[PDB]
Amino acid sequence: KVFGRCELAAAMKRHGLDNYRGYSLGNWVCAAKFESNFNTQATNRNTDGSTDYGILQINSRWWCNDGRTPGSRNLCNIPCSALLSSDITASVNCAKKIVSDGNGMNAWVAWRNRCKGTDVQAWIRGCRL
Ligand code: NA
């Protein structure tokens, strides 16, 4: 599923991402925009042989099992395919563990390089929330 900006913001808000560990909704929408272009089905293989999955491009090295990332962990206790669902519940729940892991949203390289230190609340402008 390719979400709308406001459609995704609403779904993120409902699932408790707004101001989660201090990160406004605009930080999450910006991240999803630059990680996946709001596509739940997005996959990107990494040179370490891990893969990034879904709307927030969660990595198979630590967070989910895809059956082909050797010596990887599965800290969100989920198959990576779950992160590709049109329902973002598993992506949101897993993102809450990630952002709680010590480095905040710096865990998302596209957030650090394209959202952090920008006017992120721009990403929810015009949205009924
Ligand atoms: Na894994």
From Swiss-Prot:
InterPro entries: Glyco_hydro_22, Glyco_hydro_22_CS, Glyco_hydro_22_lys, Lysozyme-like_dom_sf
SMART domains cross-referenced by the UniProt entry: LYZ1 (SM00263)
Note: Lysozyme C is capable of both hydrolysis and transglycosylation; it also shows a slight esterase activity. It acts rapidly on both peptide-substituted and unsubstituted peptidoglycan, and slowly on chitin oligosaccharides.
GO molecular function: beta-N-acetylglucosaminidase activity; identical protein binding; lysozyme activity
Record gene name: LYZ
Catalytic residues (UniProt): 35, 52
Record keywords, A-Z: Allergen, Antimicrobial, Bacteriolytic enzyme, Disulfide bond, Glycosidase, Hydrolase, Secreted, Signal
Domain C-type lysozyme: 1-129
One Pfam family, short name: Lys
Entry binding sites for substrate: 101
Protein name listed in UniProt: Lysozyme C
Summary of the tissues where the protein is detected: In the egg white and polymorphonuclear leukocytes.
UniProt EC number: 3.2.1.17
The reaction(s) this protein catalyses: Hydrolysis of (1->4)-beta-linkages between N-acetylmuramic acid and N-acetyl-D-glucosamine residues in a peptidoglycan and between N-acetyl-D-glucosamine residues in chitodextrins
GO cellular component: cytoplasm; endoplasmic reticulum; extracellular space
Domain of life assignment: Eukaryota
